[PDB]
């Protein structure tokens, strides 16, 4: 029973948290809707 | 006669997507850290209000698509069955600047000016205004979903002044105010729309809008005023 | 939160243009490429509907 | 008989929804424009929706050389007030009597209704205009 | 017969002066508003000038009781270019007839007009508005 | 007829003096309160001041037995802008008809009038209750 | 006969609910307000709550051209306290006795009612405005 | 700002607000407006 | 005419969250300790 | 009878579709070109799309040897407008009465219709050449 705690005490498991869901990474708000930005 | 219809739509957002057709087994998965995804966003800040305070002010101050300018207004002879006087910039538009409509204010008016040139891909701050098609001497929009603030209360000359300086703007430019009737009968009605008081504020330009508009197929009564976050004063330029 | 470097830099680039157009023109690439939001607090987890 | 008739156009002039309700002809027959021959049912305008600078036109005349005239009434409510009612309109275009009527009652206080184009000495009460406006 | 009647409203719904002349009932008689009793000669309105954003009304019906519909004609000329003809306006309401005549000839590509309330049916010919624009 | 009856109560809800003047029946006799027989002079309510919050009624009827009704009119004045009207009020309780009559006509942006209680389908005219409000 | 006819009008001055119990027309009919034709049912205000501020009007008069006139009972109860009686109220308009008679009863003491405009000597009941508050 | 008509003879109860205006905070106080019709009493700007 | 309407609604706070459909199998991991939360609180303390 | 008879070519020259509506022959009957006892049904047109530079023929007589004339009426509206109507045209070619009757009335002001080619003395009303435009 994990929990987003085991998640961030763990380095590779909180980057591939952070690298997943593009954490680090802003929001395009373009006319046609938001993206997010590479 | 017979007709049937059957829609039927499936979203997954996080567990293992590849069991979005077996409700059971995504559940079972939601337990799995590897699949765990962003679900909602409960606050968002600007891009601009992450850096530090020189720099974001002026970023800021450059971000605003519209210039302003106050300028004198002249009343409009004529329309002396009105309740209100109405008043029109004084004097020519100068060169590159637009005006929004007609206002009941008599202090002063607001003259803007897009910041950004005109791009591929971009929708521009402003709209020109035609003539109407008709039975309608009233301006309309060349791009859909612009809006003005003000009915004309004249004929709309599309191509001499001061009907060729007037502009529409983007719809986000934009709030919904409220009006301020005048006049004892629906004849003589005029609107002075005011800014929606708030705790994204809009200026009070007192824009004038008759609700009966002697003619047909004219276009919607404006409802809106400007936003004050949109327009950049005292920017020297 | 720290802003990358290169944000920075292209933040400074913008602003060190010689005329206001053509900031406001580096400005709009810069946030056409880095976005104009960031999500300053998010909820994990899943949804299916 | 045709040759009593009455036509109605309500015009929203103002900015907010005004709705009919309990519209009925209790003499003659409502029809459609320009055809006194084609009956109409009364709720075809019962509960009506009359938007912001729409019309609506409500067609009433007598039978087919029946010896009636024709009468009827309806009310103007407000929808976003709880169908309040804005006003109670009567109307009567009779055969014996040569006077027509017209009547406008309520009192609602946040709405302007004018009515002009009738007709009273004698003969059909003609076209009526009402321009409905909401304070 | 007094059962037969028109009213013309001429409205100005631009912001160019428009004149009435020609004014002549051929049959019937010009009268005062909601006063069929009252004639009023043509010289009331010929020459006349509506002013934009304001209404002209002018009301003709038959003799009092009498076998005789009403039937005229004017001009609506503009001003402006020395009185040219905008366009030219006939009305016949018979009284032994059923077809009523309204008939808006002429051409002035400077001038948009437009007319509604008219009946050719039957009966009277009833409360035409003409809104006029010089464009 | 006392059968034809009708009370007219002005009930100041507002805080400024409101006068009433040029009352008059044409018809019928004004008389006391739940009194029919003791006739009252005109005299006695015109002129008189509506003090805020406090109410004045005047009662109307037909003559005793009569084939007469009661009909009459009265202004109610502001006295505080030199005796402007606020409101001029008809009322009509006919003996030998059914349509009661109860008119509030006149213009006065500055007052708010409503009224409550009358019946014009057939017999009395009842307690009509005004309520006057400056803004 | 719909010369005999009554309104009352129950008014919550006061700040908690008082419920209608036991309403009953024994003679004539109830009716919508101004519709002596559209009869109504009793159940359509037994058992009702009149929230503070809030009126509500029950209409009775004698049926269509019978001899009877309008006679019936209801209460004023608390459902505060148990539906505990507040008041008894009785009215009748008779066709025959020229008297009316309008009875309140009951002894609670936690409540003021207190009505006005009902009229015995002759012709119908009329309007009778109740105002009940709780202490 | 006050509050109120009172029957208290002695002395009333003014109040001012300790916060300033700001994006996302509920005010303490809420301005009073002239009715809509029919009422000569204030009405809350604010729903609640 | 014909009208149905049905709305059905689980939330579970505790326990297995992944056997909130299975009653039973969520009750046979009520036991598990890496489970437990909090269902109640029975005391506040303001921070100030 | 065969001897009255109209022919109706309705010419698009303009660029944008123009529908037929409420095709409706009263007297007589429709038929196909060159076979006047040929009958067609009037479903065979209403509805119809007549495309820009497209030529539409309406063929109506009279019966086979009855003392009919034909008379009928129709509608050109404007699919690109919400069907808004463009004119109304009626045709009346009587076997009794010498005079035939073609009446296009309508106020579309974004349309022009240009009809020619009737007769109007005695005999059959003709052929009818109707050019409509677009503006």
């Known amino acids: 029973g994990d929990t987003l705690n085991d998640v961030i005490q763990d380095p590779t498991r909180r980057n591939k948290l952070i690298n997943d869901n593009n954490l680090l990474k802003g929001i395009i708000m373009g006319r046609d809707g938001p993206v997010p930005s590479s | 006669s017979q007709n049937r219809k059957l829609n039927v739509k499936y979203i997954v957002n996080g567990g293992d997507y590849t069991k979005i057709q077996n409700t059971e087994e995504w559940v079972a998965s939601t337990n799995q850290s590897e699949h765990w995804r962003v679900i909602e966003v409960t606050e968002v800040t600007a891009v601009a209000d992450l850096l530090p305070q020189p720099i974001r002010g002026q970023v800021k101050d450059l971000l605003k698509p519209l210039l302003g300018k106050w300028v004198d207004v002249e009343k409009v002879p004529g329309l002396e069955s009105l309740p209100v006087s109405v008043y029109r910039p004084k004097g020519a538009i100068p060169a590159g600047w637009f005006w929004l409509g007609d206002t009941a204010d008599a202090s002063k008016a607001l003259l803007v000016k897009p910041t950004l040139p005109a791009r591929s891909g971009r929708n521009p701050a402003l709209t020109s205004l035609h003539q109407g098609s008709g039975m309608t001497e009233q301006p309309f929009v060349d791009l859909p979903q612009y809006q003005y603030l003000s009915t004309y209360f004249g004929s709309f000359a599309h191509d001499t002044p001061p009907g060729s300086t007037l502009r529409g703007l983007r719809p986000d430019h934009v709030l919904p105010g409220r009006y301020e009737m005048h006049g004892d009968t629906i004849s003589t009605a005029v609107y002075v729309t005011r800014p929606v008081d708030v705790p994204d504020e809009c200026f009070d330009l007192k824009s004038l809008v008759r609700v009966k508009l002697p003619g047909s197929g004219n276009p919607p009564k404006p409802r809106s005023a400007l936003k004050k976050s949109m327009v950049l004063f005292d920017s020297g330029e | ?49 | 008989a045709y040759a009593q008739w009455v036509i109605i156009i309500i015009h929203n002039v103002g900015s907010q929804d005004v709705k009919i309700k309990n519209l009925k002809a209790s003499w003659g027959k409502l029809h459609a424009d320009g055809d006194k021959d084609a009956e109409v049912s009364a709720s075809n305008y019962e509960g009506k929706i009359v938007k912001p600078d729409e019309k609506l036109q409500i067609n009433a005349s007598g039978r087919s050389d029946a010896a009636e005239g024709t009468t009827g009434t309806f009310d103007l409510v407000d929808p976003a007030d709880g169908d309040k009612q804005v006003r109670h309109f009567y109307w009567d275009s009779p055969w014996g009597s040569k006077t027509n009527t017209w009547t406008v009652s309520g009192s609602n206080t946040k709405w302007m209704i004018e009515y002009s184009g009738q007709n009273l000495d004698s003969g059909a009460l003609g076209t009526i205009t009402v321009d409905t406006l909401k304070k």
């Open chain 3, 1 to 49: 939160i720290k802003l990358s470097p290169q944000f920075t830099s292209g933040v400074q680039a913008a602003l060190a243009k010689a005329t206001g157009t053509e900031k406001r023109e580096a400005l709009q690439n810069l946030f056409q490429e880095y976005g104009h939001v960031f999500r300053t607090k998010v909820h994990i987890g899943g949804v299916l509907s």
